[PDB]
């Protein structure tokens with residue numbers, strides 16, 4: 001399982017929200033120590049890159065800007081490259097808006113936008129869905145931060161960004177033109193470019209078969225599933241069957257993966 | 262074109278929201294004069310029977326409450342028939358809740374519900390969608406008031422009930438177990454029971470081919486399209502094409518249908 005680089009999912013691997021998984025932290029540290037290059041990749045739809053940077057550092061990890069690729073930032077830079085200073089309307093929360101502005105984009109009303117940017121919003125309401133609907137029906141280019149349907153939260157499942165995607169699809173027939181987040185190749189090819197590595201020299205590590213393992217197959221990188229998050233020893237067979245994908249390796253935690261090098 | 266009974270769409274035939282369509286109103290007056298039975302059918306998921314009853318009366322029509330079949334009432338009667346005193350969790354507005362209670366049903370939280378009842382809500386938010394998601398995931402019986410995706414408002418398109426349907430489908434893979442409203446046969450069968458007639462003795466009149474004409478076909482009743490609403494002389498041929506259905510009869514207005522009797 002020995003590679004030049006590692007594309008590492010954060011949630012379920014290194015932390016759970018603000019709480020570090022000690023075996024995941026340890027594993028990262030041992031990886032840096034062995035001189036492996038790492039990029040942390042997250043589908044987080046709502047927080048800016050620097051929040052997640054600051055979070056990893058609060059876990060005790062030594063991490064620079066360029067080692068963090070989060071969907072809010074990935075999405076903003078994808079647009080900006082395509083169309084410098086593009087006029088955008090988003091359904092998303094402050095951290096997405098932040099990354100949009102940080103990439104030089106201009107935030108406008110739904111009827112002036114050249115891009116519709118769909119990200120999750122805990123403040124989603126009828127007015128905001130009306131605006132998205134109207135933007136989508138105007139036929140403007142339509143980007144989504146991530147496809148995730150449901151987030152397994154504290155008190156139970158809650159809607160993810162796929163809720164807005166599904167609503168717009170049902171009403172208009174349009175899916176997004178581009179989905180940025182895992183398992184899309186968009187965020188994955190950005191991570192490779194950042195690493196300066198070919199897929200053949202990279203492994204993709206994560207806690208979800210349908211997100212992280214799918215992401216790795218699509219760029220032709222070897223895949224490692226850890227059992228510190230959504231996938232457990234008790235549901236692994238079920239998840240393999242459910243998603244029709246197998247990881248190249250399974251480890252209890254990132255620490256254990258690293259002990260095998 | 263003569264029949265014992267008429268299932269007549271309200272919006273676009275008799276009125277436009279609170280505003281009367283005089284040819285529509287006069288048509289109803291002549292149908293009653295001829296001794297015909299009428300049931301007024303609307304997919305409105307937010308308004309109680311009482312409200313549509315009083316609107317038709319304020320148009321100068323003599324109408325009793327048993328001549329009014331709005332989707333709120335149709336949904337509540339459907340559920341109460343299947344399970345008296347059913348416990349219901351709903352996404353809907355006060356007018357739906359009213360009809361549910363009137364039919365003897367009990368409004369409860371998502372984890373106590375025996376039925377998920379999806380109706381449109383202008384005050385839809387993330388908390389309501391989370392409840393709807395959880396109820397949906399529990400596998401309980403799932404009824405939608407009506408399937409309409411987009412309602413053409415004065416300000417422009419706005420989401421209909423199908424927004425919530427679409428969101429829930431995308432997230433969970435579940436479509437409603439039952440759709441009440443047109444063109445589903447469900448509301449059309451409540452209509453025939455309320456009328457005490459067979460489809461062969463009824464004509465279905467409305468302004469949308471994909472809603473009313475298709476509702477008429479689902480019970481094999483003869484269908485009449487009027488041109489006082491969504492469908493016009495100018496777009497008639499486009500609509501027949503778009504929706505792949507032809508009405509048995511087309512008339513400028515309800516008045517014209519009745520003149521031809």
Ligand SMILES: [Ca+2]
Nearest residue numbers: 009011012207
């Ligand atoms: Ca994860």
Ligand SMILES: [Ca+2]
Nearest residue numbers: 270272273468
């Ligand atoms: Ca109508």
